[PDB]
């Protein structure tokens, strides 16, 4: 019977299966909350250096902004 | 039929049950001491107890240093890793040399992991989302049909987007892998094949198994695969990972933290009975091309507890170490690394051994050769080199076939030796005739 | 007129090796003349390439400059034909900034191995007799015919989409892929209506297809291993086939590809077509490159390697040592050397005769004698270069044949190395950095 | 500025055709990104990440499907469908037979004793783009009769697949003039039922019959020599009557090859 | 036994420094043998390390090859323990294509300084035998706990989070009171009864809301890389750190000092060990001159054998292959060659670690070979002799097995002789 | 400006919900219109390097610049000149004070000849430090 | 079209500037709407090369990442 099964089709005994990757999952690196609070500073001693933002390239240009200046 | 190569005739070390070397077996002849030593190294590797043990095959060119290293690989079998390498490969443009060495160290440590895979497959009967503000899809409801039954499932919105990926609609046959979230639309069901005379769809039968199946398999991986898969992650679903994957991929200088974490989770798998470790062999042929920075790094790498067995090969004499610019040392290797190494001595072959190897290569390449031509090739091999004499067999056979003969004779070998010249003869032409 | 992109180059006259069926060279044939022994050896190597059994054999062509080493290489290239790969580079090309030298040589090796993929397909091919689409979900109907039979097809929706995007209409001759419904339009058998204004392209006509409307056919596609590597190297890595951003393809990809190609070979899908890699001026390679080649030639997927160099005892690059041909003796033992001799008076005359035929130049016998003596005295390439100049000088005086005076005129105008060096030594104070 | 230089695969074709033909490599592992876990994320950091991801998703919405289509990895191979035909020589012969019969305008019945072989035959017929109807043990007599009548009335269906062990009453006529036997069972009663339905298929039209046999194997031994006539008693007798009913001579005659 | 990923190596047998409470070395203890002066000096340096007050201290271990300086460093690592950083590298590793030599040494310095932070949490726990959760959303947390059941009223605005990540019947979960996070344990047998690798715990215990402190030790390099980019923490694993900007580092130094003075953090100085420092160049040593003058610098340990040797990047020569500008800024520990008894005891310890039994005559012969050729050669022959004994079905290694292995595998002294016997055969002398 | 943030739900709502994901905050003290003078010290830290790669932004390219690798680039002299111009303008307006400082190059012998030859021009500048 | 926004009046206040009243005022129009004027742009050749080298190559003009 087994030989007849082989004679019909080998997949009746040893079917081919799909290859696939081994899903490993994430590593879950822990750390403390203060590590993310570094470089945070405080509102009364930080930020609002937008006066030096030459690269802003906002709406309209110096040829019209000179009239706004004076 | 497979193509014949230089070491294709090598099938093993040809040792007897007592560990001693037979004079001619498994494609190798002679060199009995080195073959016995390599058998001891094979016993060392299969024990799986040791780490970082190093070996150097040292001898003149053409004495079989590469052949014995490959004979070890045949003796070990395909189940053990065997990562061949040549010393010139460390000079990469993307990553430093020591990273290349450490990556090849990790490639030689295998791991056989039992993985449990959840899969869903069936004809999509219906597909309806469910969304609401905390606006966004909470989940999608999907029905699946097979010959043995049907089932209703609720799935993550990531899989829902991976379904809109394949343009999946009702009546289509799909394959979902829940571990990775991978989705494959195999095609449309064969029930709808007769509905049109001509349609662009590709039809497949209905699945015959259960709608939800739980399957166990064994996966062959290395530690380097685990390192690379977590260093440059690829299986995520967040937008940031997708943006990062648009970058051109390059090799990166993987840290020791990641390798330590991978060692930790591998040990957890081993303790849980999920995985089996299969440490293997790294083979660095022509180590003389490594520089002093590479040699010095191998001091620490070979002293690690994780490291594999390493096999080196070199043919140099008292040569200058590369990168040192005045320091001569034996084998082109520093003394300090050479202290950490067991040396296997390889010898030159007698004329009889040359004739025997020539006959083996002849019957390997499918060539009949008379005894007179065989003796003449042996004389040529003694006069010039073994490798030159072996290389004349196929051209002589081609000339014999062109002449209508079914076997090499002496005149064909004479004609080929007249046409093709060896390095010593050509150098004599350069030096004398000029 | 009609100057195609290929014009008369240095080796355009060569179209083969000019060998008998028994590989015995003819004195002048297929643009080649002289170098009997080297041409015979190249014929034997070409037969080795054609049979394809043996992997990684290496050959070196050696001799003085101007002796036809590169000519023999292009003769092998032309005799081999386009179906088998023949990758040609200079030794300087591997020194890339995008990738290492070993990576570049690996890519060059794998460019020279072809994979002859073969698969079955089913098509529907016929003249469109009628099409109808009831667009309001869309439905439609199509009719196709051959010279033998006609059939009406009730269309599915996606087939209607493909037909509309391709704008298929009656009178067209199309081919429809049954597997995926892709449509390709071959032409038209009936003219479009002349009542319609502005859509009046004349075009050209195509005959109706014959036989069955639906046919099953075999199709063969040829790709190199490097193409398979680059396609599988990354997502959207096919662009690097043209842009060249193939930086350091990972080795695991190559191992997977080799295994898949082997199992395709056993499963009847593919045939391996091993080609040739030619490296002209191989003395530019570094010691690391030769060391890599030592092991790269030992793979079963290795192609036949051919190299050309002229150096005698000469320094190896990257080292302070010297060896024959500027190549280490580790590699010279692995290869067969083919020697080219200098040409005689008659061979030079025949080369110049063949070159005049290629350039469509008529010269007198006294002119041929004078140019032959010039070529023997200075160089073959200089005498070849004087032919075109002498023809132009003859043309501007409205002559019909190149005479001795035209040759002497261009000899006066254009100088060779020896005379230019002599005159430079006269002005040695005027020239800089002696 | 533009041209047909994209034809890298030869013979014309879009380059996606050749890419699909040779793109098979999958990662050995694949893994998700590592996750930075803290007991209590600060508000500003989480606010920035929320803003950034919302902006990226909203602004990649026009590009999104093509984007994630280009970026996603390949994690499943699956066997190629041609291997179904290649792995069995009987299917290799059946491909030629069915192509000839379809060129002749014929219709066939394909029979086998194993339900699973019918499941493979479905994939084979879909590989050859042939429509079919299936009957087996699991089909009810009402479903069986209805599907047989569907095959009889409709010429759109090329063939019919039937289990030999699920013949059953009710079939009065067959709209086909050709029959193919994929295998023959050891039970003589099924041989009798096959030979009777070779007759009651009908004399209203001339018919042909085919039987596939694996050469140089037990199938050729059982068929040509007729060794089943020695084995025939065991089906009704059962095993308990005699352990060694099949003699050593019978074993030598049956289990042998040239 | 099942093969763990850690297997027996060169320095696996040593597990500390063999020192009593007075730092006086024992002759053989914790796997170490001999080197009494060097071991005492290493103990003094170790007590200097773990006190942590003095910054930027440098030490060099020097001696002939095979004298155990690397073994001494590994013993210091084992005795120090995992609670303090110990960064170990080779000098060849700083030559990166991703970053400069100074940057590599900078982040090697910063990996060796730990920042210890303690964080408080409030957590609720319960067994998911059933969830009567509707999802606005409504629920009552129908979970179980041994002391008393985890029924608890819920705020309706966030109950969808409880059902978000596939919380299902037959599980055990934990919930945070202030963060709102939820985590799962999996197919517990008490709840899942009716999967592999799931938490097989019983029903949870405690009074639901349980207090828990957690301690994290984060190196300065981790703080640098995390804050350098939006998802910079991936660079700790991929190594895709570029040259970190100086502006990030001084801000982090200021913040760490602020945390230290405020009591919110503690500094844990560690050790950087650079084996084979003679691969470093003048630029690296010049950087190390000033890197060791920072208050946030670790203890530095270095190993190199050398004599008067050329400094890399120069034609100059100096003792130990190091400039004397740096040698003034460090203390030198000297390791002496081993005696016969110490060699024999080391071989005894190695045979014990490798699980090898040998005769006393075999020990004598191997000790003769160790003094004759080298210690590491003699250690190598233990495993090979055991394998040769095993193949002949022997129980203990005999002298004949060692002689057999000595005939098969040979050392540099005999290989060089045999090479010189075939000088023309060997290449490029 | 247009800046808005919820500091947190008030601490009086202790029994509003049985759980939380965000902590509460107490009321502030003093007048609601808090106001005071501040001082901040800067260098290139947020002037040259800030205008080299624009941090922030709301278009696609800025957002996926936020996850690209940070890489140092060779800043142009023109940007430094414009920075000097605007800083001089704001010094004239009186809201900024220029504080020149010191650069200390220890082990200066390790510099290359190119570095010294550049240091000639660099030290000859009028904007340079001690 | 290319519509742009210059400022606003805040007509509720009059004759105030730089203090806490009418601080958001910029300017009032002062002439007829057809304001034809000539504007001259001074630029180096290298800036034109950098602007033309990329879709947003002008950022490289600041960073020097050409």
Swiss-Prot record, chain B:
It is found in: Nucleus matrix; Nucleus, Nucleoplasm; Cytoplasm; Membrane. It is an enzyme of class 3 (hydrolase). Its EC number is 3.6.4.12. Ubiquitously expressed with high expression in heart, skeletal muscle and testis. It catalyses: ATP + H2O = ADP + phosphate + H(+). ATP binds at residues 59-66. GO terms for molecular function: ADP binding; ATP binding; ATP hydrolysis activity; ATPase binding; cadherin binding; DNA helicase activity; TBP-class protein binding; TFIID-class transcription factor complex binding. There is a cross-link at residues 208, 428 (Glycyl lysine isopeptide (Lys-Gly) (interchain with G-Cter in SUMO2)). PANTHER family: RUVB-RELATED REPTIN AND PONTIN. Binding to MYC is dependent on a Myc domain essential for oncogenic activity. Forms homohexameric rings. Can form a dodecamer with RUVBL2 made of two stacked hexameric rings; however, even though RUVBL1 and RUVBL2 are present in equimolar ratio, the oligomeric status of each hexamer is not known. Oligomerization may regulate binding to nucleic acids and conversely, binding to nucleic acids may affect the dodecameric assembly. Interaction of the complex with DHX34 results in conformational changes of the N-terminus of the RUVBL2 subunits, resulting in loss of nucleotide binding ability and ATP hydrolysis of the complex. This is RuvB-like 1. It comes from Homo sapiens (Human).
Swiss-Prot record, chain C:
ATP binds at residues 63-70. Keywords: Acetylation, Activator, ATP-binding, Chromatin regulator, Cytoplasm, DNA damage, DNA recombination, DNA repair, Growth regulation, Helicase, Hydrolase, Isopeptide bond, Membrane, Nucleotide-binding, Nucleus, Phosphoprotein, Transcription, Transcription regulation, Ubl conjugation. It is found in: Nucleus matrix; Nucleus, Nucleoplasm; Cytoplasm; Membrane. Changing residue 281 to Q: Reduces ATPase activity. Decreases interaction with NOPCHAP1. No effect on formation of RUVBL1-RUVBL2 heteromeric complex. There is a cross-link at residue 425 (Glycyl lysine isopeptide (Lys-Gly) (interchain with G-Cter in SUMO2)). Ubiquitously expressed. Highly expressed in testis and thymus. One of its GO terms (molecular function) is ATPase binding. Signal peptide: none annotated. Its main location: nucleus. It catalyses: ATP + H2O = ADP + phosphate + H(+). SMART domains: AAA. The keyword Nucleus applies. PANTHER family: RUVB-RELATED REPTIN AND PONTIN (PTHR11093). Possesses single-stranded DNA-stimulated ATPase and ATP-dependent DNA helicase (5' to 3') activity; hexamerization is thought to be critical for ATP hydrolysis and adjacent subunits in the ring-like structure contribute to the ATPase activity. Component of the NuA4 histone acetyltransferase complex which is involved in transcriptional activation of select genes principally by acetylation of nucleosomal histones H4 and H2A. This modification may both alter nucleosome -DNA interactions and promote interaction of the modified histones with other proteins which positively regulate transcription. The C-terminal domain is required for association with ATF2. This is RuvB-like 2. It comes from Homo sapiens. The gene is RUVBL2.
UniProtKB/Swiss-Prot annotation, chain D:
Signal peptide: none annotated. Component of the NuA4 histone acetyltransferase complex which contains the catalytic subunit KAT5/TIP60 and the subunits EP400, TRRAP/PAF400, BRD8/SMAP, EPC1, DMAP1/DNMAP1, RUVBL1/TIP49, RUVBL2, ING3, actin, ACTL6A/BAF53A, MORF4L1/MRG15, MORF4L2/MRGX, MRGBP, YEATS4/GAS41, VPS72/YL1 and MEAF6. May also participate in the formation of NuA4 related complexes which lack the KAT5/TIP60 catalytic subunit, but which include the SWI/SNF related protein SRCAP. The NuA4 complex interacts with MYC and the adenovirus E1A protein. EP400 interacts with TRRAP, RUVBL1 and RUVBL2. Residues 90-247 form the Helicase C-terminal domain. The chain holds residues 1810 to 2067 of 3159 of the full protein. It is found in: Nucleus. Component of the NuA4 histone acetyltransferase complex which is involved in transcriptional activation of select genes principally by acetylation of nucleosomal histones H4 and H2A. This modification may both alter nucleosome - DNA interactions and promote interaction of the modified histones with other proteins which positively regulate transcription. May be required for transcriptional activation of E2F1 and MYC target genes during cellular proliferation. This is E1A-binding protein p400. Belongs to the SNF2/RAD54 helicase family. SWR1 subfamily. Ubiquitously expressed.
């Amino acid at each position: 019977v087994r030989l007849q099964r082989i004679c019909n089709h080998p997949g009746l005994v040893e079917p081919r299966h799909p290859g696939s990757s081994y899903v490993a999952g994430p590593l879950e690196y822990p750390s403390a909350s203060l590590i993310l609070k570094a470089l945070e500073r405080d509102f009364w001693k930080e930020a609002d250096l937008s006066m030096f933002d030459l690269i802003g390239l906002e709406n309209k240009i110096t040829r019209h902004e000179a009239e706004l200046l004076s | 039929t497979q193509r014949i190569a230089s070491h294709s005739h090598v099938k093993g070390l040809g040792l007897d049950e007592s560990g001693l070397a037979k004079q001619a077996a498994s494609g190798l002849v002679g060199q009995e001491n080195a073959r016995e030593a390599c058998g001891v190294i094979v016993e060392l590797i299969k024990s799986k107890k040791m780490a970082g043990r190093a070996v150097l095959l040292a001898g003149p060119p053409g004495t079989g240093k590469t052949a014995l290293a490959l004979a070890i690989a045949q003796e070990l079998g395909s189940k053990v890793p065997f990562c061949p390498m040549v010393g010139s490969e460390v000079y990469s443009t993307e990553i430093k040399k020591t990273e290349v060495l450490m990556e090849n160290f990790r490639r030689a440590i295998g791991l056989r992991i039992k993985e449990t895979k959840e899969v869903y497959e069936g004809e999509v009967t219906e597909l309806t989302p469910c969304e609401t503000e905390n606006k966004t899809i909470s989940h999608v409801i999907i029905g699946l049909k097979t010959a043995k039954g049907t089932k209703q499932l609720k799935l993550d919105p990531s899989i829902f987007e991976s379904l809109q990926k394949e343009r999946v609609e009702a009546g289509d046959v799909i394959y979902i892998e829940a571990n990775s979230g991978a989705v494959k639309r195999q095609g449309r069901c064969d029930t709808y094949a007769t509905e049109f005379d001509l349609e662009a769809e590709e039809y497949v039968p209905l699945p015959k198994g259960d709608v939800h199946k739980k399957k166990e398999i064994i996966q062959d991986v290395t530690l380097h695969d685990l390192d690379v898969a977590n260093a440059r992650p690829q299986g995520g679903q967040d937008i940031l990972s997708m943006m990062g994957q648009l970058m051109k991929p390059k090799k990166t200088e993987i840290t020791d933290k990641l390798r330590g974490e991978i060692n930790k989770v591998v040990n957890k798998y081993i303790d849980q009975g999920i995985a089996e470790l299969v440490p293997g062999v790294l083979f660095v042929d022509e180590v003389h091309m490594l520089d002093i920075e590479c040699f010095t790094y191998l001091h620490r790498a070979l002293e690690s507890s994780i490291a594999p067995i390493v096999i080196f090969a070199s043919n140099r004499g008292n040569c200058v170490i590369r990168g040192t610019e005045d320091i001569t040392s034996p084998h082109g290797i520093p003394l300090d690394l050479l202290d950490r190494v067991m040396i296997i001595r390889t010898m030159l072959y007698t004329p009889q051994e040359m004739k025997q190897i020539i006959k083996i290569r002849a019957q390997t390449e499918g060539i009949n050769i008379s005894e007179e031509a065989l003796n003449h090739l042996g004389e040529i091999g003694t006069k010039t080199t073994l490798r030159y004499s072996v290389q004349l067999l196929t051209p002589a056979n081609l000339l014999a076939k062109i002449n209508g003969k079914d076997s090499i004779e002496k005149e064909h070998v004479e004609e080929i030796s007249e046409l093709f010249y060896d390095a010593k003869s050509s150098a004599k032409i350069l030096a004398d005739q000029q | 007129d009609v100057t195609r992109i290929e014009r008369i180059g240095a080796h355009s006259h060569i179209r083969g090796l000019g060998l008998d069926d028994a590989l015995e060279p003819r004195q002048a044939s297929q643009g080649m003349v002289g170098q009997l022994a080297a041409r015979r050896a190249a014929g034997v190597v070409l037969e080795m390439i054609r049979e394809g059994k043996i992997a990684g054999r290496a050959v070196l062509i050696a001799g003085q400059p101007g002796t036809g080493k590169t000519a023999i290489a292009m003769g092998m290239a032309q005799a081999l034909g386009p179906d088998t790969p023949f990758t040609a580079i200079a030794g300087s090309e591997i020194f890339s900034l995008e990738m290492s030298k070993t990576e570049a040589l690996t890519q060059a090796f794998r460019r020279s191995i072809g994979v002859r993929i073969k698969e079955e397909t089913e098509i529907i091919e016929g003249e469109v007799v009628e099409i109808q689409i009831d667009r309001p979900s869309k439905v439609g109907k199509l009719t196709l015919k051959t010279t033998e039979m006609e059939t009406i097809y009730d269309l599915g929706t996606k087939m209607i989409e493909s037909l509309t995007k391709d704008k298929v209409q009656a009178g067209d001759v199309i081919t429809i892929d049954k597997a995926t419904g892709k449509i390709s339009k071959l032409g038209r058998s009936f003219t479009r209506a002349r009542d319609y204004d502005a859509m009046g392209s004349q075009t050209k006509f195509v005959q109706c297809p014959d036989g069955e409307l639906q046919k099953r056919k075999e199709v063969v596609h040829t790709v190199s291993l490097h193409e398979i590597d680059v396609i599988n190297s990354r997502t959207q890595g096919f662009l690097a086939l043209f842009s060249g951003d193939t930086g350091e393809i990972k080795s695991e990809v190559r191992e997977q590809i080799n295994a898949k190609v082997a199992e395709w070979r056993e499963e009847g899908k593919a045939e391996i077509i091993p080609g040739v890699l030619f490296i002209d001026e191989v003395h530019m390679l570094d010691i690391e490159s030769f060391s890599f080649l030592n092991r790269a030639l030992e793979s079963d997927m290795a192609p036949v390697l051919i190299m050309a160099t002229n150096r005698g005892i000469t320094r190896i690059r990257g080292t302070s040592y010297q060896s024959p041909h500027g190549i280490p003796i580790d590699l010279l033992d692995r290869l067969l050397i083919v020697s080219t001799t200098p040409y005689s008076e008659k061979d030079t005359k025949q080369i110049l005769r063949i070159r005049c035929e290629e350039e469509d130049v008529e010269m007198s016998e006294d002119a041929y004698t004078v140019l032959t003596r010039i070529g023997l005295e200075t160089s073959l390439r200089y005498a070849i270069q004087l032919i075109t100049a002498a023809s132009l000088v003859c043309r501007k005086r409205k002559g019909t044949e190149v005479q001795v005076d035209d040759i002497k005129r261009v000899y006066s105008l254009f100088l060779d190395e020896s005379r230019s060096t002599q005159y430079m030594k006269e002005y040695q104070d005027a020239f800089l950095f002696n | 500025p533009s041209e047909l230089m994209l034809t890298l695969c030869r013979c014309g074709e879009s380059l996606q055709d050749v890419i699909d033909r040779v793109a098979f490599v999958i990662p050995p592992v694949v893994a998700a990104p590592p996750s930075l876990r803290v007991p209590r994320p600060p508000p500003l950091y989480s606010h920035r990440m929320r803003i950034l991801r919302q902006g990226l998703r909203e602004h990649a919405a026009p590009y999104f499907q093509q984007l994630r289509q280009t970026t996603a990895p390949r994690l499943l191979q699956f066997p190629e469908l041609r291997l179904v035909q290649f792995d069995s020589g009987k299917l290799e012969a059946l491909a030629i037979l069915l192509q000839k019969l379809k060129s002749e305008g014929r219709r066939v019945l394909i029979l086998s004793q194993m339900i699973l072989m019918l499941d493979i035959l479905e994939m084979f017929l879909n590989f050859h783009y042939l429509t079919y109807v299936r009957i087996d043990e699991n089909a009810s007599s009402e479903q069986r009769q209805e599907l047989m009548r569907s095959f009889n009335r409709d010429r759109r269906i090329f063939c019919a697949i039937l289990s030999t062990h699920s013949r059953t009453t009710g079939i009065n006529l067959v709209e086909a003039d050709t029959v193919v036997f994929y295998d023959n069972d050891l039970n003589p009663v099924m041989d009798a039922k096959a030979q009777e339905w070779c007759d009651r298929i009908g004399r209203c039209k001339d018919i042909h019959i085919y039987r596939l046999v694996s050469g140089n194997s037990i199938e050729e031994k059982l068929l040509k020599n007729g060794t089943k006539d020695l084995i025939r008693e065991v089906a009704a007798q059962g095993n308990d009557y005699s352990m060694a009913f099949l003699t050593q001579r019978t074993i030598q005659e049956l289990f042998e090859v040239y």
